[PDB]
Subunit: 103 residues, 5 copies
Amino acid sequence: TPQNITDLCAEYHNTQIHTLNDKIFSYTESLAGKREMAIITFKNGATFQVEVPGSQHIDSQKKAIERMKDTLRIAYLTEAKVEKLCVWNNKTPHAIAAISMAN
Amino acid sequence: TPQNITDLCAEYHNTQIHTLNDKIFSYTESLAGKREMAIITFKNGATFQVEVPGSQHIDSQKKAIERMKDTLRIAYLTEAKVEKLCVWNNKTPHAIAAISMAN
Amino acid sequence: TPQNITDLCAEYHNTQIHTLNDKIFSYTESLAGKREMAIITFKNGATFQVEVPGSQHIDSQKKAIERMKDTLRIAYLTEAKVEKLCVWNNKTPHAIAAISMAN
Amino acid sequence: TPQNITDLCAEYHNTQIHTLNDKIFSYTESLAGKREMAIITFKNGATFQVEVPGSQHIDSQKKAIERMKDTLRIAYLTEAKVEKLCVWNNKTPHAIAAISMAN
Amino acid sequence: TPQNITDLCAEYHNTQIHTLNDKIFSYTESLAGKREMAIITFKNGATFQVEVPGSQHIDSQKKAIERMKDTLRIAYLTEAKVEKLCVWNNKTPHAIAAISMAN
Ligand SMILES: CCNC1C(=O)C(=O)C1NC(COC(=O)NCCCCCC(=O)N[C@@H]1O[C@H](CO)[C@H](O)[C@H](O)[C@H]1O)COC(=O)NCCCCCC(=O)N[C@@H]1O[C@H](CO)[C@H](O)[C@H](O)[C@H]1O
Ligand SMILES: COC(=O)NCCCCCC(=O)N[C@@H]1O[C@H](CO)[C@H](O)[C@H](O)[C@H]1O
Ligand SMILES: COC(=O)NCCCCCC(=O)N[C@@H]1O[C@H](CO)[C@H](O)[C@H](O)[C@H]1O
Ligand SMILES: COC(=O)NCCCCCC(=O)N[C@@H]1O[C@H](CO)[C@H](O)[C@H](O)[C@H]1O
Ligand SMILES: CCNC1C(=O)C(=O)C1NC
């Protein structure tokens, strides 16, 4: 299995790594119908989403999407430094596939 | 997808943005039948609810309503500044649709 | 919907408000069969329970009872001041219906 | 209902109170098959388990077992003093039925 | 049942104990399809995974897999010392079976 987020990200099409090495600057979450999603930004302005669950997701990703939003909220609150994000770049904002945290 | 809470709010009828830039002053939660909801206030008296789940909501919103109540509780206990709330203004207290947190 | 815990409490029979304005002195939780409950106390000796889910509870209350125990746990560990409790005073210990936290 | 852990404990057979008045020294958790359990120890060497869910447990206990492991984890990480444990003493290590935290 | 992680680890084939006695250096999690997993590293370079739920796991392990990722995340964020990891060494990175935390 992948040793790290870079190797993981390279298993998928339409993905790229973002190297932030910074805490999350803003955390937004919505319960509005058809927009049950989270959005994060970094101080430089870069913005990322956790997509609404949809037909592009297999069933096993549903639990992981929920975990990711949990992760991002606690990371935000604790000011944890985000090392990298693996994202799908065929979406706007780019859609988070994975996160790594390291100080 | 929207890039921010103001753009997400504009996708819906009966909504408005409240810009708080302050921590939550009080957090109330109830398990009473037909009033399984949360209510928050800010120092200025502005009061908001997470609605009881009902026939207005679609299935995808159920998990999101639960997550929002989680978010408000931890925001309250950590003293996190709430930047904005997107709310439906056809309810009293105004009903939370989305929240943004920023330093 | 109610704007605050006092008005919420007044919608129900057999309830009262307790004003504590104090942190929780003790937190107790059990997984013993038929006693899957939580008990909290304050330094003045006031004792409250989160009832075991029963026939008095409607389906919508189930997730809220679980959330309440979550809330009491974290409130205890963070030493959060409890403002008021809305309780059913037709049970001993009085049974928690709602909680407000402020100050 | 019981007002405290000692009275609760006394409603069951094969139980005893252990008085710790101390934080948890170690926390261990496993996902290995048939050993999906938690183990905690105290600096006096006392060791306790949250048992693997089994045929002895009624349905209402399943959620409470999960909650207890959540509680022990957070108690460990926050260095919360454990007052007492109600345990079943017909298991080795003794099996937790209830926990009280104070002081 | 086992009283500690070493004894629990010994009950399984293809396992070994790693003694870290250190906080987690990095925490990675993914929601990408078929890679819904977590990876952790330590400053000595040691890398470990929580495997994707698969046909090697029994039902009872599914909740525990989810709990382990929760535990790792919060351990990382609180800089909790990890004492030992019980792992399967027939996977690369070695796959976490159990964790012990102690001061
Ligand atoms: C009802 C299913 N039984 C059991 C349990 O849940 C449990 O522990 C059960 N049985 C225990 C072990 O019993 C035996 O070893 N029995 C076999 C040997 C018996 C020799 C006698 C014999 O041959 N009798 C013959 O039996 C035949 C039928 O086979 C005929 O009837 C014939 O007529 C007769 O002569 C016994 O354990 C107890 O005494 N236990 C206390 C009660 C436990 C009830 C459930 C419970 O509350 N368990 C508790 O759950 C907690 C979690 O909620 C904790 O896990 C506690 O540790 C746990 O006790
Ligand atoms: C005996 O078991 C039951 O079915 N009781 C149900 C009768 C109808 C329930 C009426 C009711 O509102 N009970 C009330 O429920 C509350 C929980 O929601 C509290 O437990 C109050 O103490 C109880 O008076
Ligand atoms: C984790 O491994 C297990 O719990 N079980 C697998 C061990 C079984 C391998 C050896 C084997 O095939 N034993 C065979 O089991 C069969 C049932 O399946 C029959 O009882 C055979 O008589 C026995 O020789
Ligand atoms: C023994 O009987 C069972 O209940 N079997 C269920 C299937 C699992 C048997 C094979 C097995 O033990 N695989 C082992 O699973 C572990 C997870 O639990 C790890 O993935 C190990 O790398 C793998 O070798
Ligand atoms: C059939 C003999 N037994 C086994 C085998 O082959 C395995 O692998 C076994 N069990 C752990």
